[PDB]
Amino acid sequence: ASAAKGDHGGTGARTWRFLTFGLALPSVALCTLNSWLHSGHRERPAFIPYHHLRIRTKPFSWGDGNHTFFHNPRVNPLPTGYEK
Amino acid sequence: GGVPTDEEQATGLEREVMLAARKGQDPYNILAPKATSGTKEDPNLVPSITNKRIVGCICEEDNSTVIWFWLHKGEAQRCPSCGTHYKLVPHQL
Amino acid sequence: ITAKPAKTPTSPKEQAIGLSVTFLSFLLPAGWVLYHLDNYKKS
Amino acid sequence: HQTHAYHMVNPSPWPLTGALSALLMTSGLTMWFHFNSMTLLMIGLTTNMLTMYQWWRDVIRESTFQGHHTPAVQKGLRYGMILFIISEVLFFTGFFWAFYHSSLAPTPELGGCWPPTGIHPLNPLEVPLLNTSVLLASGVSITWAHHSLMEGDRKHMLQALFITITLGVYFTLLQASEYYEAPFTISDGVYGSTFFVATGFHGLHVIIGSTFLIVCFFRQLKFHFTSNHHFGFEAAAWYWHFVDVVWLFLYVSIYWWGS
Amino acid sequence: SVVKSEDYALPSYVDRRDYPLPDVAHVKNLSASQKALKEKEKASWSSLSIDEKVELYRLKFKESFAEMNRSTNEWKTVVGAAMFFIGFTALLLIWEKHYVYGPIPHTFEEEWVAKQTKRMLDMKVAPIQGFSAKWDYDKNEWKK
Amino acid sequence: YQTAPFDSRFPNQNQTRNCWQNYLDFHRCEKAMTAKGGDVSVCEWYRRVYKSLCPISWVSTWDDRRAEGTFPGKI
Amino acid sequence: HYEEGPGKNIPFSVENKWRLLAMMTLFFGSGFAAPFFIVRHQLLKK
Amino acid sequence: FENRVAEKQKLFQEDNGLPVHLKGGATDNILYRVTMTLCLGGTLYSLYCLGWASFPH
Amino acid sequence: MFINRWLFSTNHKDIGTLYLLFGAWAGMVGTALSLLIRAELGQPGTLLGDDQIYNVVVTAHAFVMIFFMVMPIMIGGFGNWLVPLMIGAPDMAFPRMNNMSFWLLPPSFLLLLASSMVEAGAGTGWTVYPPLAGNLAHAGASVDLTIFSLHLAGVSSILGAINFITTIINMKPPAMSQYQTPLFVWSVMITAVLLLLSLPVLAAGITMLLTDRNLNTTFFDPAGGGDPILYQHLFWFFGHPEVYILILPGFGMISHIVTYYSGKKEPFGYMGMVWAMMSIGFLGFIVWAHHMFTVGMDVDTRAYFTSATMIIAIPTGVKVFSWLATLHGGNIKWSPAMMWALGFIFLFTVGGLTGIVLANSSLDIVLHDTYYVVAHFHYVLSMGAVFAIMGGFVHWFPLFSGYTLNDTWAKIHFAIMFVGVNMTFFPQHFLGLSGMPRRYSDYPDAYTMWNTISSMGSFISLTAVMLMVFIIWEAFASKREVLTVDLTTTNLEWLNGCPPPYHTFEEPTYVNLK
Amino acid sequence: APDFHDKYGNAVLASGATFCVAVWVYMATQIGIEWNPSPVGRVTPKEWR
Amino acid sequence: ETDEEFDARWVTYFNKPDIDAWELRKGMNTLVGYDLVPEPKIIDAALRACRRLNDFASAVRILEVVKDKAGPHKEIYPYVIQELRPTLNELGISTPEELGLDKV
Amino acid sequence: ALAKPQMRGLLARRLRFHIVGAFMVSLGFATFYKFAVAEKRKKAYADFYRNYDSMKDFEEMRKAGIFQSAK
Amino acid sequence: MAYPMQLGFQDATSPIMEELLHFHDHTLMIVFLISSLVLYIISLMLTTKLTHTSTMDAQEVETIWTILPAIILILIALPSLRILYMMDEINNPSLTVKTMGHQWYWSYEYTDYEDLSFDSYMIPTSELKPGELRLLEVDNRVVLPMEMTIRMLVSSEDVLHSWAVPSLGLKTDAIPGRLNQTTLMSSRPGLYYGQCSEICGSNHSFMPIVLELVPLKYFEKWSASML
Numbered sequence A: 001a002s003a004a005k006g007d008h009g010g011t012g013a014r015t016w017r018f019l020t021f022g023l024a025l026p027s028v029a030l031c032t033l034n035s036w037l038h039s040g041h042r043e044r045p046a047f048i049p050y051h052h053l054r055i056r057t058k059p060f061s062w063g064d065g066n067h068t069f070f071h072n073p074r075v076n077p078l079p080t081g082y083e084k
Numbered sequence B: 001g002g003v004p005t006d007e008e009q010a011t012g013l014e015r016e017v018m019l020a021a022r023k024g025q026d027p028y029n030i031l032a033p034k035a036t037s038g039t040k041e042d043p044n045l046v047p048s049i050t051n052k053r054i055v056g057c058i059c060e061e062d063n064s065t066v067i068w069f070w071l072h073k074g075e076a077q078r079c080p081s082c083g084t085h086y087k088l089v090p091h092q093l
Numbered sequence C: 001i002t003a004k005p006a007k008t009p010t011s012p013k014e015q016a017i018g019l020s021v022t023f024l025s026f027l028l029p030a031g032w033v034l035y036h037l038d039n040y041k042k043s
Numbered sequence D: 001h002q003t004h005a006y007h008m009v010n011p012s013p014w015p016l017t018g019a020l021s022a023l024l025m026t027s028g029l030t031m032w033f034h035f036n037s038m039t040l041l042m043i044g045l046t047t048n049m050l051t052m053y054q055w056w057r058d059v060i061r062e063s064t065f066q067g068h069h070t071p072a073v074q075k076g077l078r079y080g081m082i083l084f085i086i087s088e089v090l091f092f093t094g095f096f097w098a099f100y101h102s103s104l105a106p107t108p109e110l111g112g113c114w115p116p117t118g119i120h121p122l123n124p125l126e127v128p129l130l131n132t133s134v135l136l137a138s139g140v141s142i143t144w145a146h147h148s149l150m151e152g153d154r155k156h157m158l159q160a161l162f163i164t165i166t167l168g169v170y171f172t173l174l175q176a177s178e179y180y181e182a183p184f185t186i187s188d189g190v191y192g193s194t195f196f197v198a199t200g201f202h203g204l205h206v207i208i209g210s211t212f213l214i215v216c217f218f219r220q221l222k223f224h225f226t227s228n229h230h231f232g233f234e235a236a237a238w239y240w241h242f243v244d245v246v247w248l249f250l251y252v253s254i255y256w257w258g259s
Numbered sequence E: 001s002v003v004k005s006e007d008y009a010l011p012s013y014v015d016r017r018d019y020p021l022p023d024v025a026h027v028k029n030l031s032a033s034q035k036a037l038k039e040k041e042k043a044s045w046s047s048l049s050i051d052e053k054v055e056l057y058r059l060k061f062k063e064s065f066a067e068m069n070r071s072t073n074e075w076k077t078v079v080g081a082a083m084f085f086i087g088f089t090a091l092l093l094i095w096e097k098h099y100v101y102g103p104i105p106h107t108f109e110e111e112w113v114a115k116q117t118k119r120m121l122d123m124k125v126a127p128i129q130g131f132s133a134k135w136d137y138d139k140n141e142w143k144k
Numbered sequence F: 001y002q003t004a005p006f007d008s009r010f011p012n013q014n015q016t017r018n019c020w021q022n023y024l025d026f027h028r029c030e031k032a033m034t035a036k037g038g039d040v041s042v043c044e045w046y047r048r049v050y051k052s053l054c055p056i057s058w059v060s061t062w063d064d065r066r067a068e069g070t071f072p073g074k075i
Numbered sequence G: 001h002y003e004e005g006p007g008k009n010i011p012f013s014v015e016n017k018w019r020l021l022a023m024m025t026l027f028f029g030s031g032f033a034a035p036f037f038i039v040r041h042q043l044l045k046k
Numbered sequence H: 001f002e003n004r005v006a007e008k009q010k011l012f013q014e015d016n017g018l019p020v021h022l023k024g025g026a027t028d029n030i031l032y033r034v035t036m037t038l039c040l041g042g043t044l045y046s047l048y049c050l051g052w053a054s055f056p057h
Numbered sequence I: 001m002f003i004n005r006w007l008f009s010t011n012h013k014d015i016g017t018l019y020l021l022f023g024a025w026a027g028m029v030g031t032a033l034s035l036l037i038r039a040e041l042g043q044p045g046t047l048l049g050d051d052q053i054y055n056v057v058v059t060a061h062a063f064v065m066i067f068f069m070v071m072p073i074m075i076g077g078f079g080n081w082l083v084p085l086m087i088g089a090p091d092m093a094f095p096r097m098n099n100m101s102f103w104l105l106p107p108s109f110l111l112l113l114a115s116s117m118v119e120a121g122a123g124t125g126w127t128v129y130p131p132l133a134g135n136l137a138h139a140g141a142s143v144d145l146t147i148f149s150l151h152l153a154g155v156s157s158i159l160g161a162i163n164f165i166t167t168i169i170n171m172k173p174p175a176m177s178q179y180q181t182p183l184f185v186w187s188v189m190i191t192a193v194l195l196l197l198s199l200p201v202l203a204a205g206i207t208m209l210l211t212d213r214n215l216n217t218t219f220f221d222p223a224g225g226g227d228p229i230l231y232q233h234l235f236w237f238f239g240h241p242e243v244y245i246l247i248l249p250g251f252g253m254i255s256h257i258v259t260y261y262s263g264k265k266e267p268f269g270y271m272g273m274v275w276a277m278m279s280i281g282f283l284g285f286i287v288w289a290h291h292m293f294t295v296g297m298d299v300d301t302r303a304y305f306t307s308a309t310m311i312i313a314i315p316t317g318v319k320v321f322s323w324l325a326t327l328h329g330g331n332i333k334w335s336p337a338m339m340w341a342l343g344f345i346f347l348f349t350v351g352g353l354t355g356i357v358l359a360n361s362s363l364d365i366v367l368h369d370t371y372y373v374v375a376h377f378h379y380v381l382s383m384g385a386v387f388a389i390m391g392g393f394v395h396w397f398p399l400f401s402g403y404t405l406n407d408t409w410a411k412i413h414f415a416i417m418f419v420g421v422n423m424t425f426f427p428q429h430f431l432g433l434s435g436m437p438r439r440y441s442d443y444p445d446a447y448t449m450w451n452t453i454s455s456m457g458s459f460i461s462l463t464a465v466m467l468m469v470f471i472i473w474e475a476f477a478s479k480r481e482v483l484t485v486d487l488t489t490t491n492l493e494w495l496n497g498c499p500p501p502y503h504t505f506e507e508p509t510y511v512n513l514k
Numbered sequence J: 001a002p003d004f005h006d007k008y009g010n011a012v013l014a015s016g017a018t019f020c021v022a023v024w025v026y027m028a029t030q031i032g033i034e035w036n037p038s039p040v041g042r043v044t045p046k047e048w049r
Numbered sequence K: 001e002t003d004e005e006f007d008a009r010w011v012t013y014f015n016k017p018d019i020d021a022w023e024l025r026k027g028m029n030t031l032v033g034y035d036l037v038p039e040p041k042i043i044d045a046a047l048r049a050c051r052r053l054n055d056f057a058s059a060v061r062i063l064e065v066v067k068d069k070a071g072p073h074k075e076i077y078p079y080v081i082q083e084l085r086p087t088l089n090e091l092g093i094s095t096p097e098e099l100g101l102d103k104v
Numbered sequence L: 001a002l003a004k005p006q007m008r009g010l011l012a013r014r015l016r017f018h019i020v021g022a023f024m025v026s027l028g029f030a031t032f033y034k035f036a037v038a039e040k041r042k043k044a045y046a047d048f049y050r051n052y053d054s055m056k057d058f059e060e061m062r063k064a065g066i067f068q069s070a071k
Numbered sequence M: 001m002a003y004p005m006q007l008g009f010q011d012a013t014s015p016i017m018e019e020l021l022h023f024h025d026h027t028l029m030i031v032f033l034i035s036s037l038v039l040y041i042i043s044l045m046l047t048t049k050l051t052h053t054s055t056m057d058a059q060e061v062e063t064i065w066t067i068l069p070a071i072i073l074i075l076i077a078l079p080s081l082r083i084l085y086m087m088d089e090i091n092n093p094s095l096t097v098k099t100m101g102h103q104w105y106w107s108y109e110y111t112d113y114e115d116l117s118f119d120s121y122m123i124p125t126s127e128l129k130p131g132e133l134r135l136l137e138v139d140n141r142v143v144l145p146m147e148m149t150i151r152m153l154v155s156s157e158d159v160l161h162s163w164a165v166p167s168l169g170l171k172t173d174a175i176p177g178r179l180n181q182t183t184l185m186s187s188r189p190g191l192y193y194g195q196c197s198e199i200c201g202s203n204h205s206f207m208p209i210v211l212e213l214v215p216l217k218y219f220e221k222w223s224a225s226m227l
Ligand SMILES: CCCCCCCCCCCCCCCCCC(=O)OCC(COC(=O)CCCCCCCCCCCCCCCCC)OC(=O)CCCCCCCCCCCCCCCCC
Pocket: I350, I354, I422, I423, I426, I427, I429, I430, I433, M007, M008, M009, M028, M031, M032, M035, M036, M039
């Protein structure tokens, strides 16, 4: 492809800055919109103590040994289920 | 503006190589020397800053074997394989 | 290659001492552990 | 006195301190994992940071301040950097391999399907797409930086490099937040294992690449780069593109195709 | 004659079958009579004596081809020494058998082996070529 | 019925999916019949095949997990 | 700058051959002995 | 900010015999001493820990 | 002065000497581990204890010989000493990073000793397969200390390989093309490109083992959906290249030793030697699942890996025939280095050919995990890699130290080693065909005869090992200084004298383009 | 002038060989090593059941 | 090129009147690399070059290398000396055997 | 007077003579091997099975008392 | 089983094991020939005073010594891969037996009809009966009908093991979570022995396999009796 624009006389700083502010940062701002939109809590599913999940062959080396490193009580159940 | 150039800011050996290249000279051996005809009257002239330097002779184009020998200050020496003549031209930089 | 004669010649006798002492340095510690395996094995 | 263009380096203690630091960080992870103590590890992390700090300081002394980087030196360092990035690519390769192996033939324990039963993947169109555009944007703003530097423009070099850094940072913050929000964890079988380990080593590289861009920002502030000689900047721009490209493969493989 | 370590970068003398004319003479300094000999050498060589011819040879070269190529008795020392040390190894194995190795298992006792051999024959271990093939089940003995 | 026959869907040395598939089929079949009130004995072929193929500890663990509500396959 | 030449480009002294013997003996000797002492360690442990 | 590269070049090219890792002056010596002391001390500590873990507790 | 020179080195010859001392000391460790193996095996019944301690010894034996003796000697030792001299370069490209490749090795070795001191050791095999290597069948620190040792040794070689590739590519005289570097330099570059690409795969795989052991991942644990056979693929994707890394610098030394003692100015068929090493290095990445033919692989997969594996015989045979052709017509010097080379040619050939037998996956069902594989790989490693090292060691010892060995004693050591290794490993073919398994502390009684003799051979090799140490002492103790060396015109590394000065090629060589 | 090998080679060879043969014959036959040779032709099979 | 052209090149080489000591050595050292024993006419020309260079010893060494190059073909060296005998006589070159230089 | 001997390509001559001898020897050993090892083996297996009676082998084994499952 | 001083393979017990024997003879003859050619050439190169030390032309001889080996590899691969695909053709087993490896013993399940399964452990040396083989005997052998095609399925319940019986030419790894398949047909009744062939911890040396091959009718009664 060629995407759908033009220039190519030279590739100098002016061009790449034109692309930074005219294409790249706008896209980031559109994706930031779209995300800060589909964000906010989706509903936690019923806990089922599946044996292929919540693995523990050895206690983790921090906390009480049973919590993952970025444990989020809202959405990460422990092997025996979601926390108090 | 606001970014130094090499002309303004390069220093030490890097500046030395840059200035010399400007004058078309090669005190740091970046370039490969071109062979003379290699006869007794037209020997390859081998600069050095001492009174001997190791030469490697690639006798024929594409040989993979290089022939290595110390060239000493004095009468021209010949490659022990093809006899092309070499002569040391000592001292300086 | 050619070389010079030894600066510090090592006589047959001195080579015997160097060899004997070399072999003992390998054989003795190991021989001591293995000789005592039994007391290790069962203690 | 030499008459070649190569750099004879002064005897240095950083190779030994770097090695001892690797021993203290490995011994230290062992002690953390099995003997419930973090002390050796914290010592090894500290000597490691001091070693990298002084070693790279000294490379800056040798080049910017002492002029040892002749073209032939600089050409070697370009090779060193390409080769290093090649070896990081192969390292990511073994993790992509792991991921395709488990996802392509999901075993009975997972339900015989991918994603496993009980796994609810992130939507690749929400924060993962946003991360994707952040890192693609940062590859455009760093190319602007690089052209500014070559055209001798100090101020636009600094503004583009700053924008590039802020985007690295934003990616890192987005990803930390996603890690906290994700309903699956590293212990959720081979799905959380492949997800967190692959994307986690990528995040570590984004942190390292961002640190290197920040070293470049401060060296540029101090006028170290010329419009023609700026290897540290080039190397950090290659590494940065390497980080963006590994993200694109992770996004396509893990977030989009593995969802 | 006297070769010096500080001469390494300079052409040197060597006796080699395949490099018969080395880069320098074996002797380069000459006494008064050796100087006269080199002058005589500029006149007909027929007027040189056998002794003179030998001395000119010996100034140019160190050893002749017959000398440099001679074989030695070194092989007797290498083979006899290797044997001596291989013999010394058996002493190590004797000590290990005496001090380290305990009794072997009871299954190598002679009567166990006889019973075990019968049983392998009854189960026809390797009956095509390896083992039972060598037993004669008709004459009840090992095939001759 | 002597043993499970060659099945061209699982021609290779690794027979793990042959076992799992027949275990699934049998229990999906058992369910469909007992749902629509009717005859479980049509399901017999799959039960024979998975019994022939499948390690006893795997059957037993899969049975235990279907009882427990944690069997990850779809029945 | 450093000493150059035979016997000088090495981290151990060869000035005296019997001192050298002792040092070589401890050197190669320790390497060889170590697995024997680690086995013994493991045996004497449980 | 101003360009003071030239002053640093003068400093690091001073013909005083010092290796580059110490050429910045006395702060180099301190940081060196801190690094080397943490490396050597933490190595002795790793050996101690090895000794400790080598026996049952 | 001592500390600056030896702990803060930035010189390629001195760091090369450090590697040579470290690899020789590891060699003594590895020899002791191997004598512990054969002492257990030299008599039926249990000598040391059950299989755990036995296979802790087996595991350490292999890790020490491979990572601590072979790769340091060949690549860090001979590579650092020789490569910059053979291309007339003043040092390596990254002389300080080179010193860190060295100093990563004692900590790596210390972690490996730690592993065998704590708990009950790692009795996993050097391939460290899970689940036996996992946190239930090998609970506690030993396997983690092992993985961390491998990570240090990995970083050491990946940084080494980047330094070698760069030095070789970037630091030749400007007139010298790649096709004017000696074959040893070609072998070190080839080996470094294999290191660069293979060790990061091993590092990803052992890192997954680490996380399975400590972070509750399940890459190799079927309970979370993982697969033990995945670890095997990642391991062997490094592991087959690893074995070409172990022999490639050997093929390079052999070519220089044969050429030199045949009185020749060059090896026969240079560009075919280059081709053969590059082909071998390429093919060595697409064959690894020949280490997996009993794991339950589809037939056409097995057919491809059998075929791709056999194809390596072609380039490898070009080399073998070109060494013969270098000997052809030579003025043969029967120096001890030449004997180690000639023994190499033959015994490596034997081991490459039992390798071809194994490549046949139908027969490998029966040969796999038996002593037939152990005889294969000791012919190529304890006869091949080791004889090249010994050949290169006696050849270049006078270059590195400035003193000569006693040639009679060095010929005696060769003879004793040659008998010991062949008595050790030749009968292992019979134990293999007859079915004796690998990794066993005891064996059915029928196997007793070949295991007794194999153990007696190992004691003969011990005797050679101790003799070598004495021989190296005698050389330093007598101090016969080198005066003259032949064939410098085609052996640049000798042209600065013995030992060369600390700084060489401070004025580079002159080479014309014409 | 005779060298080492001219003076001693014959004695080195003769006594190295003799010693090696003696000590290996003794090792092999006098100290209780179990070689486990084949029973073929040597063992008389005996009832075991 | 035929054998005859090979030989004639080597005859010409050593027959150059002002051949120097470097060229004499270069020619013999190159020639003995080949898988042949030099024809008597080539040896003749090198022996005569030894004479113009006033080097008796190298003439004797040239005869030694002819004997060496023939290896186990013991018939070659006597034939070559037979053929060189007028030249040996003319120049007063004694053979290695006449000088005792064949004794080990 | 002595006749002129052959003086050229003596190494090459020796080479060719022996390589052809090594070929001849190789064929001769192939011949011998595929007769004393390979055909011998095929004939051993064929001879063993030509009139092999497996029930009778079994009955001999059963009477000698070897089996857990057959007395 | 192996017997004392054995040099080669255990006698074949299945048609496929015999096929491996003849393919090994074909290959070993190639192996002995090439290695003896190399040793021969080496000694040829080293036994002459004749020299030829100048540059030698390579592009000619490299043809031969590249094509000849290629042809040899083909002469090896052809039978090698005929045997491979043979061992893979469809065959219709009469009977499926599972074996599960454990630390350190094997358990066997014959569940085509009834639930029959048992554990098979090495007979300890001090309990060997007169005549029995140290390390090789089990309390409960794997009885199987002779002259019939049996599908064997191999897995593990803890670490890797591997299930081998050399005389039948069998070795199938035992990997947890996986069910590997292999077929077994014995031409003869008798006792056939194997040993665990993947490192699996303290008693890896001590968990052997003994198959007891008998007529079908004896196998049927044995099975009934083991319920
Ligand atoms: C150490 C103890 C040896 C015990 C000997 C056997 C006892 C016989 C009892 C007396 C009773 C004999 C009657 C029974 C016949 C059994 C047939 C069979 O089942 O057949 C299966 C056997 C057949 O094996 C044999 O048929 C014995 C092989 C002997 C080959 C001789 C060359 C090696 C040199 C000799 C000593 C080894 C030291 C060098 C080893 C290094 C490698 C050569 O199984 C093998 O595969 C073992 C070999 C594996 C292959 C490696 C291949 C390449 C080797 C080297 C080539 C040398 C070339 C130059 C030839 C070189 C000339 C020296």
